[PDB]
DNA sequence: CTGACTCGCA
DNA sequence: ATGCGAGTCAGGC
């Protein structure tokens, strides 16, 4: 039966009690300067929808919205807040987000819209978007008839549902995780989103220039080994010419047919010139679609910038994730693709790019987790713990370390902190699946504090059915019990690593949180633009370079406080590229 | 429109 | 071995 509400043509004051659900309904996925269609309120008073013409344009509506003491509980408030900002109006005091409640109640559930977080409640008197909206070609905002019950349903959901969604939290030991970190964030990213990052358009173009001769060449060159032409794109094609055509030997097999992957032709490129020139075509390649076009595509022709949308309520350890562009997996191990980096540059005149970093955040956050006083120790003397993990495990001194064991003991400290398995290390290092296990074994001799967290971690995920981070971010984990081996050890391995990849987001999360206000405190001009897993990108007045050298390292080292110190490493300069 | 396969990042 | 997003090709509606 239809719900009950006001389909209002002017605000009034009982529409601005100082406690209320409120829906700013953004149908268009990519929020930014886009419309806003409906707004809904639900309060003491009642259930009211308004026209956002009428809305956004009443004096008092506005500044209820800007009020910090005119309290809202929204769902995914971010989304709201950055269209607001594009319309020059600010969104203040949304002390609960059911978006962010549901996300880290579970993460798994995917819940991208109230219909989802509500059937988590057993409340179902609400539509899901998608039902309401439609999938693609055919999404669009339906007659305002439809449009406003639409949204008095979801506001009146978010205000029935806030007060259970606390409850499991504060069981949870996760209300101070909402209310704390992840709301205060959920601000700071809007705030990162709509600034944007600025891009040097004619550079890329430039790029793109030399990329596209250079692949040019390339491409006829591979046509010529192959005695024809053929779509080097296309792992299909591809497959027939080398392991058809020119009878290289198949070392390795997709699932519907040949494997092309850089690592299978790497081990082929011995046999045929045409395995290098296909993996020199893959990677510029790469680097024009994805990064040369892809990234013009979203820059915005007016002021040249580009405005990601960070998910942070998307990722299973508690990341962020990063689109419409993704910053987050911008080149830099490759100089050629590193490049890509000279073309973001400062917002403004006379200003410079200052990246932080986090040096070893995974391996520190697990001497601390484990206990383990080798680790921890290796930590405190600051030593390099690759250098220091292979002397260990090959029971050698510094001197007697090659560069070819300190890449095996790094490849070993990447598979102990992704959930260690000889099968994934042995893949790895192309070596033995033995070899790989002795490996392993001589690792947790080494540090017998790991090898003891990684089976009561285990042990914990089973008697629990989850795991937790420092700060109490949860993930079940059911498949812990499954009596399928494979099944069972993926939930092993993610027992082993979320703690440690979700840690590290937690206490980078706070360093952001810490910063601004220190920011804020110094009245510095100079604000965040990106986060990268462990690393933090602003942009400020060359004149502010000095003080942030000392206060961002601080803050974010001084975020937690572990059983081994964190240490940050930064670097700033004219273009992203330079900040190193 | 959607699942594969690929590769960029931490 | 962790797990994100985007571009390509492919088959299919
Ligand atoms: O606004 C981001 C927020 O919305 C969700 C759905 O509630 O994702 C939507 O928006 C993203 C950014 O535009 C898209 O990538 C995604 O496809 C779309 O459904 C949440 O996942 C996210 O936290
Ligand atoms: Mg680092």
New binding site residues.
């Given amino acids: 039966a239809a719900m009950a509400f006001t389909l209002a043509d002017r605000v009034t004051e009982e529409m601005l009690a100082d406690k209320a659900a409120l829906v700013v309904e953004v149908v268009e996925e990519n929020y930014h300067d886009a419309p806003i269609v409906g707004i809904a309120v639900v309060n003491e008073h009642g259930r009211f929808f308004l026209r956002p013409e009428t809305a956004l344009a009443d004096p008092q509506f506005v500044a209820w919205l800007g009020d910090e003491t005119k309290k809202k509980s929204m769902f995914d408030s971010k989304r709201a807040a950055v269209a607001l900002k594009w319309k020059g109006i600010e969104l203040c005091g949304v002390s609960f987000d059911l978006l962010l409640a549901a996300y880290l109640l579970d ?1 798994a559930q995917g819940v991208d819209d109230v219909a989802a977080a509500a059937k988590m409640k057993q409340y179902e008197a609400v539509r899901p978007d998608e039902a309401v909206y439609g ?4 999404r669009a905002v339906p007659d305002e008839p439809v449009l406003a019950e639409h949204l008095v349903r979801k506001a009146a959901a978010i205000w029935e549902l806030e007060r259970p969604f606390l409850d499991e939290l504060r069981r949870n030991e996760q209300d101070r995780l909402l209310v704390e970190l992840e709301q205060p964030l959920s601000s700071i990213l809007a705030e990162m989103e709509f600034a944007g990052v600025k891009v040097d358009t004619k550079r890329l173009e430039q790029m793109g220039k030399e990329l596209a001769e250079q692949l040019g060449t390339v491409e006829q060159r591979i046509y010529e080994l192959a005695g024809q032409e053929f ?9 027939v010419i080398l392991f058809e055509k020119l009878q290289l030997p198949v070392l390795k097999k ?12 790497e081990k082929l490129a011995p046999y045929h010139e045409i395995v290098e020139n ?2 020199h075509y ?2 510029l ?7 040369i ?3 013009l ?2 820059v915005r022709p007016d002021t040249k910038k580009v405005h ?2 960070f ?1 942070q309520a ?4 508690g ?1 962020l ?6 910053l ?7 100089e050629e ?2 490049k890509i980096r000279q073309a973001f540059v400062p917002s403004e005149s006379d200003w410079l790019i200052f990246a932080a ?2 040096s070893q ?2 391996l520190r956050v697990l001497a601390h987790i484990a206990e383990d006083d080798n680790l921890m120790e290796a930590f405190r003397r600051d030593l390099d713990i690759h250098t220091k993990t292979a002397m260990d495990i090959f029971q050698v001194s510094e001197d007697e370390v090659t560069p070819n064991m300190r890449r095996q003991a ?12 000889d ?3 042995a ?3 192309n070596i033995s699946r033995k070899e ?1 296990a002795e490996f392993i074994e001589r690792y947790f001799e080494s540090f017998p504090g790991v090898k003891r967290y990684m089976e009561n971690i285990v042990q914990e995920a089973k008697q629990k059915g989850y795991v937790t981070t420092l700060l109490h971010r949860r ?1 079940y984990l059911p498949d812990i019990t499954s009596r399928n081996f494979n099944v069972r ?2 939930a092993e ?2 027992a ?3 703690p440690i ?1 979700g840690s ?1 987001a937690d206490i980078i999360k706070k360093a952001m949180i810490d910063l601004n206000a220190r920011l804020k405190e110094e009245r510095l001009q100079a604000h965040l633009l990106l986060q ?4 933090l990108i602003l942009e400020a007045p060359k004149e502010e370079m000095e003080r942030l050298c000392r206060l961002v390292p601080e803050v974010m080292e001084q975020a937690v406080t572990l059983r081994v110190p964190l240490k940050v490493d930064y670097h700033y300069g004219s273009t992203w590229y330079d900040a190193k």
């Fill in positions: 993460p999938k693609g070609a055919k779509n080097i794109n296309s792992p299909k094609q591809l497959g997709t699932k519907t047919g040949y494997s092309t992957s850089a690592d299978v032709l296909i993996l893959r990677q390649g790469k680097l024009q679609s994805t990064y076009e892809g990234l595509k979203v990601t949308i998910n998307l990722t299973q350890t990341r994730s990063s689109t419409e562009p993704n987050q997996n911008i080149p830099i191990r490759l693709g590193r970093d986090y955040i995974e790094k490849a070993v400290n990447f598979g102990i902190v992704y959930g260690i398995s099968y994934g290390l893949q790895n290092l790989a993930r050890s993926f391995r993610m082993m690593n979320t990849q590290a990268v897993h462990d690393e």
